[PDB]
Amino acid sequence: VHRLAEDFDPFQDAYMADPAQFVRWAREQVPIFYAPKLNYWVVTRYDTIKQIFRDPVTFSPSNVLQSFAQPSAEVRQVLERYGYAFNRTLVNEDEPMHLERRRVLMEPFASEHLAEHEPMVRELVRRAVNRFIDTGRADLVDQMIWEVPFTVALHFLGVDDDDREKMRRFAIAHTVNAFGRPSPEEQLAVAETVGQFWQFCGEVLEKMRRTADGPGWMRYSIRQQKLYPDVVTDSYLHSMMQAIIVAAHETTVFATTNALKTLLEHETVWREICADPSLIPAAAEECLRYNGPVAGWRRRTTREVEVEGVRLPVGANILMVVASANHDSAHFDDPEFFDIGRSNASEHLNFGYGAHQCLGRNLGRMEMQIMIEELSRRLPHMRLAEQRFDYLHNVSFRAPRHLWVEWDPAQNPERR
Numbered sequence: 001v002h003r004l005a006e007d008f009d010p011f012q013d014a015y016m017a018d019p020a021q022f023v024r025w026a027r028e029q030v031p032i033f034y035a036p037k038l039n040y041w042v043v044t045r046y047d048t049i050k051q052i053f054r055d056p057v058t059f060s061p062s063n064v065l066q067s068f069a070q071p072s073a074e075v076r077q078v079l080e081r082y083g084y085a086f087n088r089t090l091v092n093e094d095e096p097m098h099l100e101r102r103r104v105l106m107e108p109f110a111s112e113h114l115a116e117h118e119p120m121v122r123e124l125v126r127r128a129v130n131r132f133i134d135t136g137r138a139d140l141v142d143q144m145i146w147e148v149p150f151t152v153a154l155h156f157l158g159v160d161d162d163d164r165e166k167m168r169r170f171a172i173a174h175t176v177n178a179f180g181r182p183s184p185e186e187q188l189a190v191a192e193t194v195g196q197f198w199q200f201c202g203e204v205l206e207k208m209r210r211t212a213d214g215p216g217w218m219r220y221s222i223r224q225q226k227l228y229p230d231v232v233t234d235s236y237l238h239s240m241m242q243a244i245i246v247a248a249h250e251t252t253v254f255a256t257t258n259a260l261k262t263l264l265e266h267e268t269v270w271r272e273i274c275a276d277p278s279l280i281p282a283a284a285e286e287c288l289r290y291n292g293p294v295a296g297w298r299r300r301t302t303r304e305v306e307v308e309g310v311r312l313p314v315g316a317n318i319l320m321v322v323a324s325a326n327h328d329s330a331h332f333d334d335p336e337f338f339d340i341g342r343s344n345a346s347e348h349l350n351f352g353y354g355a356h357q358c359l360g361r362n363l364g365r366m367e368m369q370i371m372i373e374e375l376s377r378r379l380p381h382m383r384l385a386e387q388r389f390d391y392l393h394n395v396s397f398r399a400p401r402h403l404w405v406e407w408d409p410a411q412n413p414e415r416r
C-alpha cells in the first residue's frame with residue numbers, strides 16, 4: 001500500500017480509462033496519501049472531497065489550471081506580445097473577489113434562460129447529424145460532438161454570426177495544456193493560438209460595447225461593469241470570453257462522448273431510452289456519475305489544515321479523484337451498477353460542489369440530452385464499432401478521443 005502511494009502516477013492509460021478502479025485501493029483503505037511523483041496529496045472518498053470543495057478559503061482553486069510541464073519562457077514572450085493579461089477567472093479565482101464576481105455575473109446562467117438557447121442547440125445538433133447520417137460509419141467526436149459545445153458557447157456569449165465563423169480555428173484542445181504534461185512544442189503552439197484568440201476577442205469585446213443592450217453573457221457583463229466598475233475590470237471581461245469557452249467546450253464534449261459510449265455499451269439501457277426518450281435526463285445524469293468526464297480536480301491549501309487525520313502544510317497540492325468519489329460505495333449504493341433510475345445520481349461531483357459549483361451545468365446537461373435524444377431518435381440502430389479507445393493523459397478530464405459508430409443507412413428510421 002505504501003508502494004502504491006509512492007508509485008502513483010496518473011499519466012497512464014489505466015488512470016484515464018478507469019480512475020475509480022485505479023485508486024480503489026486508496027478509496028477503501030488509504031483516504032489520503034502523498035504522491036511523490038506529483039508532489040500532490042491524493043484523496044479518493046466522496047465525503048473527503050466534499051469537505052475540501054466546501055471551504056474555498058482554506059482550499060484554494062489556484063492550481064486548477066496549472067500544467068505539469070516545466071515553465072516555458074517562449075510561451076510568456078508570445079503571450080506578452082499579444083498583450084495577454086494572465087487573469088485568473090472564476091474557476092481558479094480566490095475569495096473574496098471570486099464570489100463577488102460570481103454574484104455579479106451569474107444571472108444569464110439561470111435555468112429560466114435555458115429555453116432561450118434550446119432551439120439553437122436542437123438546430124445545431126440536427127444539422128450535424130444530417131452531415132453523416134447517410135454514411136453508415138462516423139466518428140461521433142470529430143463529426144459532431146467536438147464542435148457543438150464550442151458553437152453553443154459562442155451563442156451563450158452572444159458572438160455575432162460573422163465572428164463565430166472567424167473563430168472556428170480557435171476551437172483547439174486545452175486539456176493537456178491545463179491539466180497534463182505538454183511537450184515544449186505543444187506549449188508554444190497553444191500559446192500562439194491563445195494569443196491570437198485574445199487579440200480577436202479584444203476586437204469582439206469593443207464591438208459588443210457598441211451594442212451593449214443586445215443578447216448574450218458578454219453584453220450582460222458589459223452592462224454590469226457600468227454598475228460595478230470596481231468589481232469587473234476590462235482585463236477580466238476580456239479574459240472571460242476565453243474562460244467561458246474553455247469551461248464550456250471540452251467538458252461537454254467529454255461528458256457527451258462518455259455518455260454515448262456508456263449507453264451503447266449497456267444495450268438494454270440504450271433500448272430503454274430509444275423506446276422512452278423521457279428517460280434521457282435521468283440517464284445522462286447517471287452517465288455523469290458512472291462514466292463522467294472529471295477524473296480529478298485540484299485544490300491548494302492556504303493554511304495548515306487536517307484532512308483525514310493528516311495535517312497538510314501551507315501551499316499543499318491536493319488531487320481530488322472525483323471519479324473515485326462518484327464510485328464511492330460509502331455514498332453510492334452498488335456503485336458499479338449503471339442504473340439510470342438511481343435516485344441520487346445528481347449528487348455526483350462532475351460539476352463540483354460549493355462556491356465554485358459549475359455555473360453552466362444545466363446548459364451542459366441540456367447539450368448532452370439533446371445530442372443523446374437526436375442520436376437515439378434518428379440512429380437507434382447504430383452500434384459501437386470495434387475500436388481502440390485512446391485517452392489524453394492528464395489529471396482532470398477523461399474521454400475517448402474518438403467514438404466510432406456504425407449503422408445501416410437503409411434502416412434509418414426517417415427512411416421508413
Ligand code: HEM
Nearest residue numbers: 090091247248251252255351352353356357358359360364
Ligand atoms: C458537462 C459539462 C461540464 C462539466 C462536467 C463542467 C465542470 C466544471 C467543474 C468541475 C467546475 C469547477 C467546480 C468547482 O470548483 O466547484 C466548473 C465550473 C464552471 N463552469 Fe463548468 N462544466 C461543464 C459545462 C459548463 C458550461 C457549458 C459552461 C458555460 C455555459 C460552464 C461554465 C463554468 C464556469 C463559469 C465555471 C466557474 C464557476 C466558478 O468558479 O464560480 N461549464 N465546471
